[PDB]
Amino acid sequence: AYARTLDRAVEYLLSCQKDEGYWWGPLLSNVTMEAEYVLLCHILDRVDRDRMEKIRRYLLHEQREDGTWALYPGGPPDLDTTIEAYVALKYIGMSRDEEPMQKALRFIQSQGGIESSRVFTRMWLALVGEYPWEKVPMVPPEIMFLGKRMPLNIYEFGSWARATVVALSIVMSRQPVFPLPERARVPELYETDVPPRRRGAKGGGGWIFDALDRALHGYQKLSVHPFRRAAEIRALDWLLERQAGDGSWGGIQPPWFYALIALKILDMTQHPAFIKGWEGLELYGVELDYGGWMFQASISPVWDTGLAVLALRAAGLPADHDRLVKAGEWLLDRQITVPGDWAVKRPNLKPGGFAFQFDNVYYPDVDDTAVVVWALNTLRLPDERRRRDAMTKGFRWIVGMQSSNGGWGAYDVDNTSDLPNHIPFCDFGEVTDPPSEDVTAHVLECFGSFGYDDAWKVIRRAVEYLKREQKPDGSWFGRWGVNYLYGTGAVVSALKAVGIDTREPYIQKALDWVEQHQNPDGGWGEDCRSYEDPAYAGKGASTPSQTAWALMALIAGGRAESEAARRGVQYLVETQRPDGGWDEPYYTGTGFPGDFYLGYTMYRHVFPTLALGRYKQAI
Amino acid sequence: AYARTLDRAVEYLLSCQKDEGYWWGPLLSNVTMEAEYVLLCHILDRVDRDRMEKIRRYLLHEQREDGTWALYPGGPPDLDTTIEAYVALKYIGMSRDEEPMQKALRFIQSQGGIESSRVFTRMWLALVGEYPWEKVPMVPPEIMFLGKRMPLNIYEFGSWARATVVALSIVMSRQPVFPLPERARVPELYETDVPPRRRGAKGGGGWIFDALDRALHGYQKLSVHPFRRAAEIRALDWLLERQAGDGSWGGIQPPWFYALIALKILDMTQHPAFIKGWEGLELYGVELDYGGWMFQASISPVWDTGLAVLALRAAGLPADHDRLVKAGEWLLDRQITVPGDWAVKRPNLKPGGFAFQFDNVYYPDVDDTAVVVWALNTLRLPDERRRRDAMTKGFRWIVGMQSSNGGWGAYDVDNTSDLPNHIPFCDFGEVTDPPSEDVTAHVLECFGSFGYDDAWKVIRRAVEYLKREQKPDGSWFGRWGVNYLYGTGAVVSALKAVGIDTREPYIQKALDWVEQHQNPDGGWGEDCRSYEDPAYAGKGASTPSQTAWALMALIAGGRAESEAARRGVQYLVETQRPDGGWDEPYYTGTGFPGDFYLGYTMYRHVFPTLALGRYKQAI
Numbered sequence A, B: 001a002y003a004r005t006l007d008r009a010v011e012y013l014l015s016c017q018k019d020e021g022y023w024w025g026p027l028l029s030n031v032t033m034e035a036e037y038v039l040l041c042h043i044l045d046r047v048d049r050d051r052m053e054k055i056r057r058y059l060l061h062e063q064r065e066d067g068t069w070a071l072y073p074g075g076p077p078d079l080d081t082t083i084e085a086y087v088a089l090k091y092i093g094m095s096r097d098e099e100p101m102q103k104a105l106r107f108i109q110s111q112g113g114i115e116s117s118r119v120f121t122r123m124w125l126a127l128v129g130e131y132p133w134e135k136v137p138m139v140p141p142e143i144m145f146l147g148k149r150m151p152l153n154i155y156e157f158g159s160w161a162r163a164t165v166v167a168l169s170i171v172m173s174r175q176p177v178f179p180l181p182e183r184a185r186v187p188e189l190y191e192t193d194v195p196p197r198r199r200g201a202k203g204g205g206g207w208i209f210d211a212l213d214r215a216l217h218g219y220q221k222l223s224v225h226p227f228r229r230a231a232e233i234r235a236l237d238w239l240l241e242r243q244a245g246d247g248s249w250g251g252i253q254p255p256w257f258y259a260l261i262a263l264k265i266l267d268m269t270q271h272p273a274f275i276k277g278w279e280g281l282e283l284y285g286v287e288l289d290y291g292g293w294m295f296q297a298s299i300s301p302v303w304d305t306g307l308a309v310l311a312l313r314a315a316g317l318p319a320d321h322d323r324l325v326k327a328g329e330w331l332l333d334r335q336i337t338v339p340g341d342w343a344v345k346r347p348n349l350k351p352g353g354f355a356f357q358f359d360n361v362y363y364p365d366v367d368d369t370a371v372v373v374w375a376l377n378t379l380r381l382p383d384e385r386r387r388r389d390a391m392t393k394g395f396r397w398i399v400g401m402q403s404s405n406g407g408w409g410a411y412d413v414d415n416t417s418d419l420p421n422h423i424p425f426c427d428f429g430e431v432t433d434p435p436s437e438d439v440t441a442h443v444l445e446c447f448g449s450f451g452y453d454d455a456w457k458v459i460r461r462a463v464e465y466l467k468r469e470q471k472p473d474g475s476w477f478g479r480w481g482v483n484y485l486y487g488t489g490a491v492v493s494a495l496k497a498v499g500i501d502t503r504e505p506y507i508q509k510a511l512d513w514v515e516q517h518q519n520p521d522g523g524w525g526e527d528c529r530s531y532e533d534p535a536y537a538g539k540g541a542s543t544p545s546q547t548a549w550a551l552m553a554l555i556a557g558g559r560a561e562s563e564a565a566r567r568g569v570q571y572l573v574e575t576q577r578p579d580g581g582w583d584e585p586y587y588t589g590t591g592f593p594g595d596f597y598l599g600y601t602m603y604r605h606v607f608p609t610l611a612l613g614r615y616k617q618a619i
């Protein structure tokens, strides 16, 4: 029955594999990536008419009927996104008259105009002189003086925010303006009677920071700022030291762009870092068949390859398949062997993790590491020396990464400070990197393959963490995936792997939750709205991946030979395409809960294959 | 008569011009460049058998009958050079038995062996474990803490030494060892009974430094060195901030190589700066027709182009010759507009100088600037705006670079400290960058073109400097050229240009000096030995360039229509080749008096053309 499906899905993945032996699916997000690219080019005075065109088609192609842009397909119109996308188009050529500009503008105004958008948006506009810098949350270069163990030192922030903060401090230090030609001036963004509904700090605004900011804006106006020169040079050095191998910073769009602006501001357009940083960009670009051009927020080569292997293995292929070996070998060359920002908290810990992208040695994440090691542990490579060796280094790194509560974070240890969550600046997505369930699950599932059970104290500490975090309805939050279906599936799958008894009450209470949300079409679905409104927890159009996740939670809990179980398998078997793939018009990936959603291209293929492979296992 | 010589020399120059419109002749030095390249590759574990082969040919090719290598063709055997060249070969494959290795070895031993070589040589050997680091002058990372105005702060050193010191501090901080295979171990370098005749500090060794060193060597052995970590990071950042566009540091072989080693030592082999820095090397490499491969100590594109223009112009070509315009345009894009290390002494001075190589914005030199501006001041470019503008910026920068005595330095102002000349480390070439005659001459000659004369205070101050420096025999020292013929020619030519009366006594006393050294063959020649032994001042085999220089001094002093004058012109006319070029088997360029000599490939062509062009002027 399903054998034909799996067989097809298998061959299909094998075709999607690159020559070097790795997998790499485009990472989808929203148009603020492209819109900001447009402004960046304008700032750096490097505009390519041909590129602008591809970006225009794309932007438009993504705008919806109502004339707006959302964070995820089928999501509500987003102000910020729409505003930036608006400015982008108007700069490329679009006249405020045209239908698109019209419908978009309307929505903008009906929301309070520019005054209701996130700091980033207002800041970008400030950069081109369409918004007063004085009304922008200030982040001083002096922040570079806070010691390792001080309130708000750059190391209390999450790896991604840290790099951005450092870069911007330089920018906000000079408050530069790169005037847009009259043709693209966007005054209309202000024309509105609707009361400006401004968004506040993530965890709440304390009158202290509220005032402190005002203080900084005043100090900003003085004629002399002692030691500021040395604060900037510190930020500069700091950035120069961590520029990733591909010329990017952290392998993400944000700090990368800002860092370049920071360099341009310091007349360093002749310096190597800038050059490399600039040309590095092309790698993240993607030529769309319909003539459009999108820019990836980040790239997932490692991740994809890692999961890809696991899937194919659980599917059936030999642990020494010549094709999987290509992957195995490739992965080994990717392992990071040098200290990264994490070292600040673990000086005596030996390097051994992995990164999300191709070359980003200073920021390996616990997630990728776990999956990569585990995936390697399932293979038979020619050089059993390096395979054995690497795994150990990766293993130990992870161990030494375990936070205080036994749960694992993404990039750092105990990065749980609650201070930065109140700064006027941080009003978008996460700013700290505390342990999450999904990550910790992938970790446990990693050790599990080696054989380490609940006996080992490490494991227990984690399980305790998971038990404590479980939601009332037996579900588990999805931090880097959408959502409860993602988390729950992760956990149950992990716990089952670490020897825990699947018969336990809290476990069963989870499985039941799964069955209770299975959509009529046989599959499972969870819309991103589940982050905003709880009524959507486990609700939404059925998707290949999300279905495959819930399917794993069931196969893991022994309920593999069940109704809901077989029902779901049917969905996958049916919905599958003639080529063996699968479609998924929705996002099942999460950047930040409620603020940034991602669509992992491979998920629709890899996970369904992994699930079917595991179903074919239970029989 | 000579006219045909000029027409031929001209058409030859124009042919040697590249497409972009610039001139660029290979810069010759000695084999320590290649020998050190070999060790570098070994250190960085990046050895290319094929390249090793091309290098081997070259090394042998340069070895003389006696089995040694000198600093300049026809020069005495050099210990350091020969030692390094020896180790290089023995590592490539050569067995100590082979005749070449034989003769070399005996010379080396007859000199006291390894114990008599410069610090650099002993250090390189220390790097591969063939010499005790303890017996190497120590340079601590802490030096990075000395403030702008303190004894021995990195800014008291000459631009070239500064960068090397910073890079080495990191290296000497860790005292790494990259063991050579037993096959290439060079113990025989010690086997000798001859008393080790060690070279001391450039300006004498003070018991203070001698003591301080021992002090630093002891401290080096402690278990904890507080703030050293910070010291290193200070040094690294200092390097990462000044890496030049082509990926080198300063555009010179020394700090470049050391800087890369410094990065290796710090596990940064996969950091942008390292990568670029490594692949930047190829540009300085040169494929020799006989199968060899040499590495340029530095490159002189700008310089050549600059002089090339002046020559051709004085020769006859229209100030708007479409070919000289290509040069004119090119040069303009080369002007530096950002602060460099010079800024430390002149914060309010506007950037406007030029560099020696293609892309080295932090180190423009007064010499190149003067020649480049002056050259431009003689052309008629399409964009008279930029031409006018560039000249002013360049000009003004030069004015603001003038030192206290009125003379001009190469890279910095008043870089006359006498402290660094006593450090145990600095025992090779120059370490500070004080004003020189030749440079100041090229500056005066520049303003001269604009019409500024002895009236302007700036010019008088200089003339006073030159008058005071003149040698008893009316000659003038040659700092960056070999030697008194080079300097004297420079000065007289300059003074004549700034309105000074060529009839003056001190002037005449100089001209006479020139006529008195004219060789029988009509031309003039000055061997590099003139730096070591005074009996060689103005003495040596005649060369095209040196002849052309003395010729300019005469044409300038009005003695153009003289015997010695016409005699010399004859030499150039006869010695010329069928293609219009000229041969010059000797070195007429100087890196450091008595320590490092260079051979400028273009000189033999450009200067003879300039001289003839000026002779044809006096008639």
Ligand SMILES: C=CCN(C)CCCCCCOc1ccc2c(-c3ccc(Br)cc3)nsc2c1
Residues within 6 Å of the ligand: A160, A161, A164, A165, A252, A253, A254, A255, A297, A298, A303, A356, A365, A366, A367, A368, A410, A426, A428, A429, A430, A431, A480, A591, A596
């Ligand atoms: C899922 C397994 C492995 N993970 C471990 C890696 C996946 C996370 C990388 C994708 C998200 O990248 C980012 C990362 C950061 C951002 C920011 C951002 C937000 C606030 C600040 Br302050 C600075 C940047 N804006 S958009 C954005 C996208």
Ligand SMILES: C=CCN(C)CCCCCCOc1ccc2c(-c3ccc(Br)cc3)nsc2c1
Residues within 6 Å of the ligand: B160, B161, B162, B164, B165, B252, B253, B254, B255, B297, B298, B303, B356, B365, B367, B368, B410, B426, B428, B429, B430, B431, B480, B591, B596
């Ligand atoms: C002539 C007009 C324009 N000039 C202005 C530029 C020409 C100077 C560049 C050629 C010389 O380059 C160097 C420059 C420096 C060195 C050193 C050296 C010596 C001592 C220390 Br301490 C560090 C490096 N060793 S070899 C060497 C070669």
Ligand SMILES: CCCCCCCCOCCOCCOCCOCCO
Residues within 6 Å of the ligand: A241, A242, A339, A340, A341, A342, A343, A344, A362, B229, B232, B233, B236, B266
């Ligand atoms: C400069 C000494 C080299 C030793 C490196 C250890 C530095 C301490 O790590 C603290 C964590 O900060 C992250 C550093 O890695 C980034 C690269 O910057 C280059 C210095 O190695």
Ligand SMILES: CCCCCCCCOCCOCCOCCOCCO
Residues within 6 Å of the ligand: A229, A232, A233, A266, B241, B242, B339, B340, B341, B342, B343, B344, B362
């Ligand atoms: C960080 C302040 C930016 C102002 C630049 C002025 C540069 C300081 O001049 C002091 C002398 O050092 C010369 C610098 O060249 C190095 C480049 O590093 C870039 C700093 O902008």
